[PDB]
Amino acid sequence: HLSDMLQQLHSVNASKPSERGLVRQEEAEDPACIPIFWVSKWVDYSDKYGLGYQLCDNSVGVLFNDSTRLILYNDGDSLQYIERDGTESYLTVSSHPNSLMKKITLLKYFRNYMSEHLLKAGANITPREGDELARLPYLRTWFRTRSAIILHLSNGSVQINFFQDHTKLILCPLMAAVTYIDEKRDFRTYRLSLLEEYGCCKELASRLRYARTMVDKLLSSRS
């Protein structure tokens, strides 16, 4: 999905959306393209353990430093563990699977911390309903720059959270759509092809150019 996302970004950036003779940004909105999943909260303990995160459906996950992943579903009991080599196993917290108690304990710690202390990004927003059978996406990779943290989910979504003004972009290659959460926490979703037609403000155009640079970085660091 990254290559597709890159092409979609090249396309919108090349149309120079903030230079449109008449920018009609609202005409490019499409609430139907709101994501099913995004990252609502995160904790970076990557010095010793890894990166913990909460998705907007209240499930939590950790990408540990040893390349393994542990996901706790929002029922607060069902677990998925993904080993280095990609093997996935379903477990429960209440079973107490001994070899995983340290990782389970850390995930619980992160979960409680996020729940007690951190704001839920997109708190106001009802996620799009997904198919019940679809697997819960997990964090494929992440990195931080001086201006943002970049989070790449296994369903192809890329989310970029800007440090300075708390603005956020969530890019969805499957719909060729972007959700922009602005400095006032207002949530707007746009179809990229419509942004090409109707243009957009300098603030959104700037962030979309930065997004292309970030997708190039993801593609350059892939595996």
Binding site: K41, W42, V43, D44, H117, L118, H166
Partner: peptide, 5 residues
Amino acid sequence: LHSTA
């Protein structure tokens, strides 16, 4: 080290 408090 964490998202917005």
